[PDB]
């Protein structure tokens, strides 16, 4: 198939939902030993997948927004923004964290919070197509 | 959303068959796990297909047969083909004791005698 074992297919990319939850440097780190990167939402297809594949769990899950500081915008591992009018990020959006502000998804609604904290997280990469 | 093994596509989930039989044998395999030979209901679901499997030479075979050449092709719930959706090549002309059926193969959708070997597609509604 497009996509190795234990990794979910969905237009053109494999999604792995991690075996562990840690901080979102750490899970970055992971998703790159793995050839990957931390989530990146485009459209609201890829949130939609995301919010199903998920379905009814309650844990949260890391994705590869983040930001400084409210001064700084939010921006994807790569540097690109967060389209407009994809989500809208709650919980810990005006405060300002020594190691940053990172995005996560919980209960299919998005939240920010201290990049510090734990989560699971969701990798990833290219699909092989020919 | 959908069970272990199969692919989870849209509202539905697809089972690339790990037997290759012949087709009446693939409909009960489908049939079984209460599911249905693949229906290509667009260029979109054929864009998946093909993706699906980009690097096969495996022939799979589809819900499309017919009877001998005098009638239409037909998927499994009687519905017909879409045009322009794909052109059906190979054995289309003569006719076979059980029937034409469909398979793709690198892609591209073929016709032979219904008695042949090949592995499936099989789909249902996924759990959503």
């Given amino acids: 198939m497009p996509c190795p074992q234990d990794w979910i297919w969905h237009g053109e990319n494999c999604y792995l939902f991690s075996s562990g939850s840690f901080n979102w ?5 992971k998703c ?3 050839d990957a990167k931390l989530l990146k939402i485009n459209s609201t297809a890829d949130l939609d997948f995301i919010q199903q594949a998920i379905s009814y769990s309650s844990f949260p899950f890391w ?3 983040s930001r400084r500081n409210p001064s700084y915008p939010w921006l994807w591992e790569d540097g690109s923004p967060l389209m407009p009018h994809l989500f809208r ?7 300002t964290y020594p ?4 995005a996560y998804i919980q209960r299919g609604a998005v939240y920010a919070e201290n ?3 734990a989560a699971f997280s969701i990798c990833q990469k290219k ?4």
């Fill in 99 to 102: 190691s940053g502000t990172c």
């Fill in 115 to 117: 990049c510090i904290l």
């Fill in 89 to 95: 990020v709650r919980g810990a959006v005006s405060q």
């Fill in 32 to 34: 790159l030993s793995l």
């Fill in 127 to 130: 699909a092989n197509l020919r």
């Fill in 25 to 29: 440097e750490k899970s970055q780190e």
């Fill in 63 to 65: 994705m590869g927004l």
